[PDB]
Each structure stands twice: as C-alpha cells, then as structure tokens.
Design a protein around this ligand. Structure first.
Ligand SMILES: Cn1cc(Cl)c(C(=O)NC2CCCC2)n1
Length: 283
C-alpha cells in the first residue's frame, strides 16, 4: 500500500502495536559473540543491546578492538551510517578513536546527558573553548571551536587532533536537544528541520566517512533518524515514490543492528516524519 493512506488505515483501526510486533517477529537474528565476551562487559551500556559480529565497527587496535557500534550500509539509497550507544566513562576515548579511524565528518546526538534524573551518556565533548579534553588511552585531543545554540538543537564545531601524527580535523556536532523524556514529539517539523541541517553540512555525503549517530542505546531515536533519511532519499531517486515501503526499509536496516525503532509510538512517528518530509522536498 501507499504510505499516507496505510497510515490513516492503521490509525482508524488502532493496530500500531500489531504492526510493530510483526516487525519484531520477522527481524534478523545474527550472532553477537564478541560483544558478550567477559572482557567487554564494561564496554556495553545495556546487556540486551549488542552489535552483530558481521557488521560491528572494529577499532584499529590489537589489544581489544571492540566498541558497541554497527555499520548500516544502504545499497540502493547509497548511504551509510554508524549507529552507536552513548559513550560510557570508560569508552569516550574509543568513541573518538572510531570517529578518527572511520573518517567521519559529523556526529549526531539525539539525547541529553541527563534524562529522567539519570545519566544517559558521558559528557564526552568540551563545554568551554579554553578547557580542551585529552584522551590518554587513545592519544587524541579535542577542542571546542564554536557553538551555535538554537531553540531545538545546537551545532558545535570541534577540532580533533591525532597526537601521534599531529594531524587535525574539523568535526561537526549536531545535537538535537528537545526530544521529550517520555514518548515522541507531537509534530515532526523540528526533527525534519534538524535532519535537513545535517544534510546541508555535507556530513552524510560520500566524500566523507559515515556519520556517527547515537542516543542512549543507539537503536530507538537513532533508528528513527536513519530510517527517515533513507526513505526520503529513495522517494527522490525512484520513478514511483509511492513504491517506498517503510516497513521493508526498516527490516533491511535491522539486518545490520538489532532493535531499531523501540516502540510502536516511534514507528508511527517515523511514518509521520516521512509523510510530512515528502511534501516539503517538492511542496
Ligand atoms: C521526497 N518525495 C519525492 C516524491 Cl516524488 C515524494 C512522494 O511521496 N510522492 C507521492 C505523491 C503521491 C504518491 C507518491 N516524496
């Protein structure tokens, strides 16, 4: 079926939970043996969210190459994304090592450091220009260059220096600051505006390594971001945009990381975002 009318048909019939459970039943199951090794217990935020072995990002290190991060490679859309958990106190150096080694331009953050009165990820970037951060375990230095605070999101320019080689690179930090502690946003308008700002920066384009996107577990809000982006790109590329099947795209993405889209409300919000986004692209 088309999307917008499939949408109203699920609303009128109140069957979002049944649609979402079908997705969960059909999703891929692949091994995640490296994630479950005992030496990696303090590298995982949640015991039930792990990268598959076949798609995990490897650190360029011979001691321990493990990070909770997955490469989502979308062949028809010609887009790749790295989805990862929010960094932990003992993985902030690994996180920036990955950004460096994978040649990423942009980092997309969809959570606040504290939500619901608990810490959802480490404070992994500097908050003042004159107070830089040094990660001694991976030999990187990170400096805040500029910060632009808007009503729904903040964009930061960061300098990452590899202290072994003295090479430097500019990294863009795109921080969506207004996702509610509970539920999903009422309107997709600010989320779409944010997606378009990430696109306009070059961070999603083939001349750079894959964008790094995270929330707390790296599957819920993070899944919503890449699902909406890929569906809108496919609607622009194909002769028949009504052929784009968001459930099929989601199942394709779940070949590369488990659990993408965590609730039926996130599924409905993803439909809403793609539907409204497709009108603005043209109007
Ligand atoms: C971004 N984008 C480009 C196109 Cl084209 C569309 C789209 O969904 N078009 C629909 C019109 C009614 C049926 C298909 N979205």
């Amino acid at each position: 079926m088309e999307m917008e009318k499939e949408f109203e048909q699920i609303d009128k019939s109140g069957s979002w939970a049944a649609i979402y459970q079908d997705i969960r039943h059909e999703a891929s199951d692949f091994p995640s043996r490296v994630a479950k090794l005992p030496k990696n217990k303090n590298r995982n935020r949640y015991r039930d969210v792990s990268p598959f072995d076949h798609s995990r990002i490897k650190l360029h290190q011979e001691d321990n190459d493990y990070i909770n991060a997955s490469l989502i490679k979308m062949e028809e859309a010609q887009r790749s994304y790295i989805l990862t958990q929010g960094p932990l106190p003992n993985t902030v150096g690994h996180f920036w090592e990955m950004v460096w080694e994978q040649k990423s331009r942009g980092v997309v953050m969809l959570n606040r450091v504290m939500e619901k009165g608990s810490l959802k990820c480490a404070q992994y970037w500097p908050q003042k220009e004159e107070k830089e951060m040094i990660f001694e375990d991976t030999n990187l230095k990170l400096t805040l260059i500029s910060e632009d605070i808007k009503s729904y999101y903040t964009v930061r320019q960061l300098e990452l220096e590899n202290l072994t080689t003295q090479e430097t690179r500019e990294i863009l930090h795109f921080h969506y600051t207004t996702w509610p502690d509970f539920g999903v946003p009422e309107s997709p308008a600010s989320f779409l505006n944010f997606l378009f700002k990430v696109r306009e920066s070059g961070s999603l384009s083939p001349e750079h390594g894959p964008v790094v996107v995270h929330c707390s577990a790296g599957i819920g809000r993070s899944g919503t971001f890449c699902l909406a982006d890929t569906c809108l790109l496919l609607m622009d590329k194909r002769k028949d945009p009504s052929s784009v099947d968001i459930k099929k795209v989601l199942l394709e993405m779940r070949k590369f990381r488990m659990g993408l889209i965590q609730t039926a409300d996130q599924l409905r919000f993803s439909y809403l975002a793609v539907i409204e986004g497709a009108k603005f692209i043209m109007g």
